[PDB]
Subunit: 69 residues, 6 copies
């Protein structure tokens, strides 16, 4: 399905640290960037996620803060 | 200050399209990826930021969803 | 793309409140319930959304709070 | 309290998945719709939530995305 | 309504910066702390918010990040 | 780093509830107020957080709702 979210970044799953209700999925999206996503275990199974899966990090623009040194 | 957020991606501001109270800053984070950030104009003033500034897109892991094809 | 968000509620657009950069879209999801979503006007244009369009309200489980009535 | 969040959908809890710190409450809100909510275990205790309790899924308008079929 | 969000901080509104669809309200929550909230102008109308209003800053635990000094 | 987030409230950690992937850190921020924050266990290690650490609750303005009686 097509999503309204402005951040939709392709990457590959390089870690999945499983837990009770939630889990943390890490995507390498190129450029030496990794995005970590905390989602429910139910979703990790439902989408089939495994180390090496192709995926997208989806982030709403209002979820992004800016920082500087 | 050092932040708990799992996602802290360094990038350069490639555009900043202003609006009334809010504003949308776009960061090139390398690998040809861009992050769009909606933050209040007060913060855009306070942090300085100009097209070409070094900055960070900071995203909490709980803000990221995963999608697949 | 298929999404990890546990809440993906089918509905029809019943209103679109335009603004300069943003807008408020309301979806009738059946059962007499409506969802409101604040998204960028750019996404509403790019997505084709119009009053009467079929769409989905997509919500992450961590974004939802639970409430109970004042007498519980 | 009366809450600023734009989405407040009434329903009955059909499951509560307990975990270490967090848990998932599922609401039937009628019309064949269910909302899943990930909240802390402390709130599920304090709110008295049990299977069959009447409750509300509360969602900010800014937390909702729109999707369409491609 | 009774709320699951653990952060429910009583305070008084000290300013309201109005905008097109949304607006920013600032609350004094005691201890010398101020919390800023961006919510739709529709909710600021519906709750009647004014400088001097009693209100609550409501924040979900999953929205709060932790920071420390270098 | 200097952050765009409107809410940065100084406090001391009063408990830390450990979990699988996440944990809940509570801050005394003065005025008898406590902020509860659910963040990843990796962030809790990395920041060194212990009961009694000085820290900040950092919250985006768009994450905050208002309620009245």
């Amino acid at each position: 399905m097509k999503l309204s979210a402005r951040n939709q970044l392709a990457g590959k799953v390089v870690s999945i640290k499983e837990g009770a209700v939630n889990g943390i999925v890490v995507l390498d999206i190129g450029g030496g960037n990794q995005i970590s996503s905390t989602i429910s275990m139910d979703s990790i199974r439902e989408l089939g996620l495994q180390v090496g899966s192709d995926a997208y990090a989806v982030i709403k623009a209002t979820s992004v803060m800016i920082g500087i040194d």
